[PDB]
């Protein structure tokens, strides 16, 4: 199914960081969570 951009951003904001027990950091600010968002948007671009 086609990814909804406004939905994806809400799912991305919930993503933790590496060492997620003690890290206490979330969302697009985390280097791999920005990367995930970029490749999910690139995957939707392909699917479409």
């Amino acid at each position: 199914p086609d990814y909804n951009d406004v939905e994806v951003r809400e799912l991305v904001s919930k993503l933790g960081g590496p060492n997620p027990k003690t890290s206490t950091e979330r969302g697009m600010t985390v280097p791999l969570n920005i990367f995930l968002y970029q490749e999910v948007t690139r995957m939707q671009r392909v699917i479409g």
Partner: protein, 45 residues
């Protein structure tokens, strides 16, 4: 991943790690099964 590890290693020392002057460390698990891996690594992928 290279960022994630250097952000963990800013307090650690001694030396403070920059993306300037870090390179990849790579080892092969050499495990009989792939399902013996139950948890992720500390600093890894």
């Amino acid at each position: 991943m290279k960022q994630e590890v250097t952000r963990n290693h800013k307090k650690k020392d001694g030396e403070a790690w920059s993306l300037d002057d870090v390179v990849y460390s790579t080892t092969v698990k050499e495990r009989e099964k792939e399902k013996d891996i139950e948890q992720p690594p500390a600093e890894g992928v």
